[PDB]
Design a protein around this ligand. Sequence first.
Ligand SMILES: Cc1cc2nc3c(=O)[nH]c(=O)nc-3n(C[C@H](O)[C@H](O)[C@H](O)COP(=O)(O)OP(=O)(O)OC[C@H]3O[C@@H](n4cnc5c(N)ncnc54)[C@H](O)[C@@H]3O)c2cc1C
Ligand SMILES: Cc1cc2nc3c(=O)[nH]c(=O)nc-3n(C[C@H](O)[C@H](O)[C@H](O)COP(=O)(O)OP(=O)(O)OC[C@H]3O[C@@H](n4cnc5c(N)ncnc54)[C@H](O)[C@@H]3O)c2cc1C
Ligand SMILES: [Ca+2]
Ligand SMILES: [Mg+2]
Ligand SMILES: [Mg+2]
Lengths: 247, 247
Amino acid sequence: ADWVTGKVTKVQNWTDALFSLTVHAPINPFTAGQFTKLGLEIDGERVQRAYSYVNAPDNPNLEFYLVTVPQGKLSPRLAALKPGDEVQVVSDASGFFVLDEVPDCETLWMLATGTAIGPYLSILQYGQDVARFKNLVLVHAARFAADLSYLPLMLELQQRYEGKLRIQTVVSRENVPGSLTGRVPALIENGELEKAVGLPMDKETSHVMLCGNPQMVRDTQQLLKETRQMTKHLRRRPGHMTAEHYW
Amino acid sequence: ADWVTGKVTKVQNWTDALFSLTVHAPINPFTAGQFTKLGLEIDGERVQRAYSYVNAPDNPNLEFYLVTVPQGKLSPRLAALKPGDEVQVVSDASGFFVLDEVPDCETLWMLATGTAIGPYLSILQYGQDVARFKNLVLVHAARFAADLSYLPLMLELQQRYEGKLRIQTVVSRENVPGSLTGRVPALIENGELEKAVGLPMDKETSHVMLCGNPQMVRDTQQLLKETRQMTKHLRRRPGHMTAEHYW
Ligand SMILES: Cc1cc2nc3c(=O)[nH]c(=O)nc-3n(C[C@H](O)[C@H](O)[C@H](O)COP(=O)(O)OP(=O)(O)OC[C@H]3O[C@@H](n4cnc5c(N)ncnc54)[C@H](O)[C@@H]3O)c2cc1C
Ligand SMILES: Cc1cc2nc3c(=O)[nH]c(=O)nc-3n(C[C@H](O)[C@H](O)[C@H](O)COP(=O)(O)OP(=O)(O)OC[C@H]3O[C@@H](n4cnc5c(N)ncnc54)[C@H](O)[C@@H]3O)c2cc1C
Ligand SMILES: [Ca+2]
Ligand SMILES: [Mg+2]
Ligand SMILES: [Mg+2]
């Protein structure tokens, strides 16, 4: 896994914990939805972690949306980077959370918690290989309204897609006009998410991508399996769900 | 002003300085765009200030979007209210920043700084008397992206308006994907706002509503007069610009 040297060109601090890095690095071409590994030297040793590309692959402004994990090894050090700093970038991207691995369906649902919205933003900004889906639905769940860092881009995407892309934000406990409140699995189970979006999530019409918090991913997959007869998708055994856990 | 007792039902703290109150109170009917006055007793005397309704006239959740003016007489005390607390509400709404005072035109531009987005949210949520406008453009200018409190609602509105409504964010003090950087008058003058929105601002096609900071309001009015032969609108001298300053 050889690497190249990236240079930080922008640091955007969204909240005390959330930031986006913009980096220029001579990486190889990647597929929208894939991740690389970013690395710094910590206590005399190379430390690296996976981070998804937020940018479309044809945009050389590499962008990563991160949360500072308390007591985390690498994230606080990435949080300390300034424009002009170097960071190590693995030159070939990894991952199967990509349209190439998503079967045709009427409605493609894309569920993310927190910083796990990245891969959907890469995919949606790139805008290729989506003609075969009638509907696209992006659901961003975060703890507070203040944590929904890509709403302006989301307004841009919604307009671009002319009604084909439907977007819904979810917050944990706040009452926020325009957002749903609560857990993604609970909002699926009680019908509120589907009512808000105005499209069903079911085996006949949907594929569901799930990205980020393992509890959200696990609980949602268990719910859809037990209550909607929806299965994990495999090349050899076609199904309805594609997942990428962030931990 | 004849008043009623409101009960705070919800308080949403957006930022250290921004908050929205929700109130139940037996007010008289109001026109979307109008304001009332909210009041508290401070050192033995009744103090009150004007606040625009954010809610549509048929929504009993009376909602006000406020900035805490540091050491302001009333706003810090309103920021201290908690659900269940009482607040004084004037029962007859005031103001002429309403669609019945807006002349027919092709594109209605709604410009607001900071908390002055309220009257537009009332108008757009009620969604009446807008058939007559081919285009609606809502420009929310704030200092930082963290200050754009109603983006989830704006995204909801943009979706339901099926392309009629265009939402544009402007942030003066940083660069955020999907936002325009700068101040409203400069961005009108240099074509950026019109470029970002995708529609012209001119005397043939436009009416412009302006709400909030008096410097934004007067600088913009002066620019459009000198530069685009657009004038302040009156019943007796029909023109292109409607204004409401917040101080
Ligand atoms: C494919 C993939 C893509 C990813 N993309 C991103 C991304 O784009 N942006 C991003 O911020 N992170 C992303 N992550 C997670 C990232 O790789 C790191 O795990 C994260 O930055 C924490 O690393 P650390 O060195 O600071 O903490 P560590 O010292 O490694 O401690 C991490 C421990 O905390 C946990 N952890 C990881 N993330 C969180 C979290 N948010 N909350 C609570 N615990 C957590 C796990 O339990 C882990 O064992 C991704 C992970 C994977 C597997
Ligand atoms: C018709 C009308 C509608 C209004 N609607 C709202 C609204 O919906 N939400 C809202 O937050 N304010 C609104 N305002 C302002 C509001 O009436 C008060 O002036 C404000 O809350 C500050 O009062 P205070 O007692 O805390 O400050 P004071 O002790 O009276 O000091 C006043 C100073 O506060 C500053 N200020 C006043 N209003 C604002 C503002 N909104 N943003 C930034 N600085 C300000 C000015 O610099 C002013 O000189 C509106 C004003 C008018 C005239
Ligand atoms: Ca009229
Ligand atoms: Mg809806
Ligand atoms: Mg645009």
